[PDB]
Each structure stands twice: as structure tokens, then as C-alpha cells.
Amino acid sequence: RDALSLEEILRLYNQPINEEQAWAVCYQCCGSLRAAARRRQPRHRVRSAAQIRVWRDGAVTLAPAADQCMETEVIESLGIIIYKALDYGLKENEERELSPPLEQLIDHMANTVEAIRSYRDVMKLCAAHLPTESDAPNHYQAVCRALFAETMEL
């Protein structure tokens, strides 16, 4: 097989993703969505983790759900789905403590803050999490590549 859904990955591990994987899926998915916007592809909200496809080479793409849409709404729905992958298997009354830069990323993506407006803004914030910003493409590809290979061993 060449791709696993984020949903499959969560089920196989029966535990949430780690923080680095959240940063990486976010960066990588936004990279693909940005390439698709260049070709005026139809925009789809991320309804569940099933739509997020992690590939053997570490690319991450967004499939349409089996069933107008602003760029910000795709981002918002991705932010929500990523948060649920970090929260996977927790009781409704418990809450994972995220590092502050990652909480901030999610808060801004989901518009729950008490300012991100494109795929490119999300990528900039993900790149800034690394000590050396220019390592982002190779590092985040490597994280998702490892996430795939490891899940395939189980």
C-alpha cells in the first residue's frame, strides 16, 4: 500500500499523534493544498481524519469527503481535525497539555482565539517551530515518511 489515512494511523496505534507529527502533517498538507489552489482545484472542508492521506514518500494530501468554501474554512477544519488527532482516546473531561507554540497554531487555525489567512501563513508558522527554518521541507517530509513506515510495521 502507498497511503494510509490519518484515521487508520490513529486506530492502528490506538493513541494520539505526537506534537512533531502534528506540525508536520499541517505543513505537508498545506503544501499540497497550495499546489492544488494553483490549478484552481475545488476546495473541500476536512470533515474527518479519514480524508487526510499520508504517503510512503512523506507527502500528505487531502481527499474529498465521500459525501462555496473559503481558504480559511479549509484551514479551520484542518485545525480542528489535527486537534482531535492530538486528543485521540481522551475522556471528554480530560485535556492534553500542548506546548504553547502548538496551542497557538491550533487556536489561530480554528479561529478560537480570544492572524492566519492562507495556506502559506500556516506553513510559515510551522517552519518557525524549527531552529533552522530552511530545514522545514526536508524535516517535515521525513517525519511523515517515518510515521508511514512505522504504522506499516504494526
Place this chain on the structure above:
Amino acid sequence: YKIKPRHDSGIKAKISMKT
């Protein structure tokens, strides 16, 4: 990772209200 009791109007709570 650290687990703590759900925070009133923290991130988990704000996100539960969007869905």
C-alpha cells in the same frame, strides 16, 4: 505527554463548540 482536567473555556472547550 501531560494530561490535565479539562479547562473551562480552554482550547479543548472552544473546539468542542465549533463542531
